[PDB]
Structure 1
Amino acid sequence: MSLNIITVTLNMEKYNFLGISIVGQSNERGGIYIGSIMKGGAVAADGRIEPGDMLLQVNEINFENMSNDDAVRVLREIVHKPGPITLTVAKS
């Protein structure tokens, strides 16, 4: 019984996509998780992140109080723009 928080910086120069899908909503009163990891993606290459892991922060953006649409939109814009990508996730 512990909380494991890992920071993973992805090789975005080699892989042009995260290859992940996010599920859930942190929007409602009272989180956002990795639904699935796609092969050929940066997240699959790193191997540390697994499905059911809670997504806390990407780069300088925090996913708290975010709807699924908004959360997907943040990720689209970050992947679209050139640069490195760093995820903070809480292991299930």
Structure 2
Amino acid sequence: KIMEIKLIKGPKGLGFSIAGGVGNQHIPGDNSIYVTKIIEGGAAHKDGKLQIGDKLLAVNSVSLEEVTHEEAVTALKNTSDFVYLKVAKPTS
């Protein structure tokens, strides 16, 4: 299940933590970026769509598939104010 989440970047960012990445696998065999924590009162929390365990596909034009952890952190920190976050809700 793929969805697009609309977020306004707050002073402290998008308001979630990530794990994963090429060379830093969160799930054995998977390079994907995963949401690990939703920050209380942050943009992602207030929107209510994003959940722990969701896979990030893209942040605006930037793919987060088959990227390093540092690449995804950079991407998420340096987005514009208005963010279209594409995510995949896990099945298992």
1:69 maps onto 2:70 in alignment? yes
Q: CA deviation at 1:22?
A: 0.7
Aligned length: 83
Q: What is the TM-score when the length of structure 2 is the normalising length?
A: 0.80
- Where structure 2 has 5 or more consecutive residues not aligned to the other structure, the ranges are 24-28
Q: Say which SS state the counterpart of residue 33 (structure 1) adopts.
A: strand
Deviations 1:31-62 (A, max 9, x none): 11101100121100011110000000110100
Aligned to 1:21: 17
The structure with more helix, counted as a fraction of residues: 1
Which residue among 2, 7, 10 is the counterpart of 2:4? 7
Distance 2:68 2:37 in 1: 18
Q: Say which SS state the counterpart of residue 58 (structure 2) adopts.
A: strand
- Where structure 1 has 5 or more consecutive residues not aligned to the other structure, the ranges are none
CA-atom RMSD, angstroms?
1.7
Whichever residue aligns with residue 69 of structure 2, its letter is N
Q: What is the TM-score when the length of structure 1 is the normalising length?
A: 0.80
Whichever residue aligns with residue 7 of structure 2, its letter is L
Aligned to 2:44: 43
Q: Percent same amino acid at aligned positions?
A: 35
Aligned to 2:87: 89
